[PDB]
């Protein structure tokens, strides 16, 4: 009847007259306010729209289970639903990401920030993107499918998502336009690899072809991070090639560059699949090989920064062994191969033989095929004790090689024709060598 509409119209205006109270905190009440909203829709087929109510209750339902939700909309359509729903979604997702630790940095803010902080902001972002892909985008598809009873649902998922995508793409651009700094390589790759996931996840959750526009942006963003990775790695190779220091490493110790460069290349290999896809043995293989060539070529010229040819060798040994150890003790050895490693061992083998000849030939001349060789020996011991051979095994074998030549040769020379050092004195003084400290004897 028209009286069944009057009663329906009544309680709506009663509820309209108090927007303070929400309809969805009263058991028998919320049951009644639906039946009224149904008769409005029935009558048309006063405005008595009460949508302003249902639109605000839905807002106050999604913000503080999802059963009141999927009933608010069946009565709402029979547009303003979509625009409202999508809004609150866009808002709540904005807050999730803020909590996660997603800033919207400017270009100036990015360029001025100290690496230690930018590092932690990128770290936060990768975590955020992982969450968005593996949790949120799926959750927002589940909600639209359950809540909305139209397929509109395609529009709602995308409009619920765009804001969330755009906000991560912002910081993607921030790092994309940042000055190229080797520091950042590993992080940019973490970001690239994280962001790559979005497309698969979005392709699985989007039925229609409106998800192509968002996928286009994400691609263009990925491709720029793709550019940022090629440029960063280039800057590393560029700065390595430019390095020309003529300060000799004291005690012939391992050069810090050798430590840094090899640490860097060892870390790249953790990103083989990405780096192989972006660069154009593996493309990374070719690059790793080139970069290590530059390091060797640089270190060879640093070995010529000595008056003593012996220290040139000790330096080349120590640094070339460290390189080979880091290659063999990682997936580097696998990539550039055995033949590469065998050759370096060859070079290290020859460098040691070069030392033993160069340093111990005049000392073995002071005994023939009065003769004071004490100055020769004292001078070697004097400063070769302050030298360093870091590797215990190599240090041991150089000493054993030295002694086995010099000691028996001295037992003969003295034992025949004889007056300062006994052969035991020399054995003990030989054991003090390469300890990076002046030996106790004098």
């Amino acid at each position: 009847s028209a009286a069944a509409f009057d009663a329906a119209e009544q309680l709506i205006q009663v509820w309209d007259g108090t927007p303070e109270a929400l309809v969805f905190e009263a058991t028998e009440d919320e049951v009644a306010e639906y039946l009224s909203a149904v008769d409005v829709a029935i009558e048309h087929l006063a405005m008595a729209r009460l949508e302003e109510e249902l639109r605000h209750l839905m807002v106050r339902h999604a913000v503080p289970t999802a059963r009141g939700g999927p009933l608010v909309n069946p009565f709402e359509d029979q547009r303003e639903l979509a625009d409202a729903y999508c809004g609150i979604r866009r808002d709540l997702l904005d807050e999730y990401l803020s909590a996660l630790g997603v800033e919207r940095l400017s270009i100036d803010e990015v360029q001025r920030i100290e690496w230690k902080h930018l590092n932690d902001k990128m770290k936060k972002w990768v975590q955020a993107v992982k969450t968005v892909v593996r949790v949120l985008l799926a959750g927002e598809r589940r909600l639209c499918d359950q809540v909305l009873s139209v397929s509109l649902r395609e529009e709602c998922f995308i409009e619920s998502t765009k804001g969330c995508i755009m906000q991560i793409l912002s910081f993607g651009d921030a790092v994309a336009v940042c000055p190229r700094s080797p520091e950042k390589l590993s992080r940019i790759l973490d970001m690239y690899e994280a962001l790559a996931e979005v497309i698969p996840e979005m392709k699985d959750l989007c039925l229609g072809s409106s998800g192509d526009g968002v996928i286009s942006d994400v691609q263009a963003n990925l491709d720029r991070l793709g550019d940022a990775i090629r440029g960063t790695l280039f800057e590393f190779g560029k700065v390595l090639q430019l390095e020309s220091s003529r300060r000799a490493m004291t005690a012939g110790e391992i050069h810090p560059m050798t430590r840094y460069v090899m640490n860097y290349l060892r870390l790249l290999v953790v990103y083989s699949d990405t780096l192989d896809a972006l660069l154009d043995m593996t493309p990374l293989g070719k690059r790793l090989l080139k970069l290590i060539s530059y390091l060797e070529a640089n270190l060879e010229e640093k070995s010529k920064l000595y008056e003593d040819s012996a220290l040139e060798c000790i330096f080349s040994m120590n640094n070339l062994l460290y390189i080979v150890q880091k290659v063999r003790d990682s997936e580097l050895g696998k990539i550039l191969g055995d033949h590469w490693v065998k050759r370096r061992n060859g070079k290290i083998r020859q460098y040691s033989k070069s030392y033993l000849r160069i340093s111990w030939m005049k000392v073995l001349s002071f005994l023939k095929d009065f003769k004071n060789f004490n100055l020769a020996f004292e001078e070697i011991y004097r400063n070769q004790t302050t030298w360093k051979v870091p590797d215990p095994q190599l240090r041991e074998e150089l000493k054993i090689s030295i002694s086995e030549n010099v000691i028996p040769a001295y037992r003969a020379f003295l034992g025949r024709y004889g007056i300062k050092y006994t052969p035991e004195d020399l054995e003990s003084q030989l054991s003090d060598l390469f300890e990076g400290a002046p030996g106790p004897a004098n």
Binding site: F236, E243, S245, R246, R247, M249, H255, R259, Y260
Partner: peptide, 27 residues
């Protein structure tokens, strides 16, 4: 006869720290 373990060919920049050298901009 440089006084730092790292020295740039292009700009003057030198340092005994590799990280500082490898992330230096050529001035």
């Amino acid at each position: 006869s440089d006084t730092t373990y790292h020295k740039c060919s292009k700009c003057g920049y030198g340092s005994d720290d590799s990280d500082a050298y490898f992330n230096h901009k050529c001035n």
